[PDB]
Design a protein around this ligand. Structure first.
Ligand SMILES: Nc1ncnc2c1ncn2[C@@H]1O[C@H](COP(=O)(O)O)[C@@H](OP(=O)(O)O)[C@H]1O
Length: 246
């Protein structure tokens, strides 16, 4: 099994739903941030090494190609951070892989990002996220890798992550750049709510009969999850409250 589909869309653009969508179409695993968090946290350090490699004056691109290949082995596809930030490299490694850009209203995206992935440094909620994630064994290593992958995406060394205006403009710039770099035939722009049709057409498959297009990982669902991890201090004790999430 090798990479058939590259997810270039940013966090909070429906990437988990897209992961579950492709897992239905291909009947093979798709990589995602949640793969790291819930199954393979050992991958965090690997991604960090690759991200840090990009910041060198002369980056070892074969080091990155090889590391990407080891991480994504046995996966048919990948979405969300940190793999989205490497969509250029992935396209090179897998010249036949198609590219998906999941996208949405820029204002709804920033709000989602703030609530789940990248709170302002002075937001009390940020402390709650960290507290809840500690139950999962997630700490500063994940947050740094996560933030670093996002800055690599936005191609910024020094950037003020607490400035909403910068984030909003980076978002537009990132999405524009994807469309510019990826040949049209090799790219599908999938807006939230688009469902099965364009995706299945683009991958030359039938629409999966009797199965609804996944709708997972809402920020309301994420807030509840953080709150329940704090309250019960155990994932397994509470997982039955979050079907279809992992
Ligand atoms: N089928 C669908 N239709 C509409 N929105 C969807 C969707 N699937 C996922 N989403 C939204 O996409 C976001 C999750 O993105 P990701 O999986 O990359 O983290 C969430 O946004 P909100 O936080 O606004 O609820 C989630 O609600």
């Amino acid at each position: 099994t090798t990479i058939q589909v590259i997810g270039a869309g940013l966090p909070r653009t429906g990437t988990n739903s897209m992961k579950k969508a492709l897992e239905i179409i291909y009947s093979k695993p798709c990589y995602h941030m949640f793969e790291i968090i819930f199954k393979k946290q050992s991958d965090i350090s690997i991604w960090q090494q690759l991200i840090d490699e990009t910041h060198k004056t002369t980056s070892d691109k074969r080091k990155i190609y090889n590391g990407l290949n080891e991480l994504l082995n046995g996966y048919i596809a990948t979405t969300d951070l940190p793999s989205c930030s490497f969509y250029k490299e992935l396209m090179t490694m897998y010249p036949n892989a198609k590219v998906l850009l999941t996208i949405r209203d820029k204002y709804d995206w920033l709000y989602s990002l703030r609530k789940v992935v990248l709170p302002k440094s002075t937001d009390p909620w940020k402390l709650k996220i960290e507290e809840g994630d500690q139950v999962l064994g997630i700490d500063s290593n994940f947050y740094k890798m996560s933030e670093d992958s996002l800055k690599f995406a936005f191609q910024k060394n020094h950037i003020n992550l607490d400035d909403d205006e910068i984030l909003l403009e980076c978002y537009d710039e990132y999405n524009r750049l994807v469309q510019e770099i990826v040949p049209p035939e090799r790219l599908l722009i999938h807006h939230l709510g688009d469902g099965w049709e364009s995706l299945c057409q683009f991958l030359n498959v039938d629409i999966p009969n009797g199965i609804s297009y996944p709708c997972a990982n809402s920020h309301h669902q994420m807030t509840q999850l953080t709150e329940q991890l704090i309250k019960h201090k155990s994932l397994d004790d509470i997982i039955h409250m979050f079907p279809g999430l992992i």
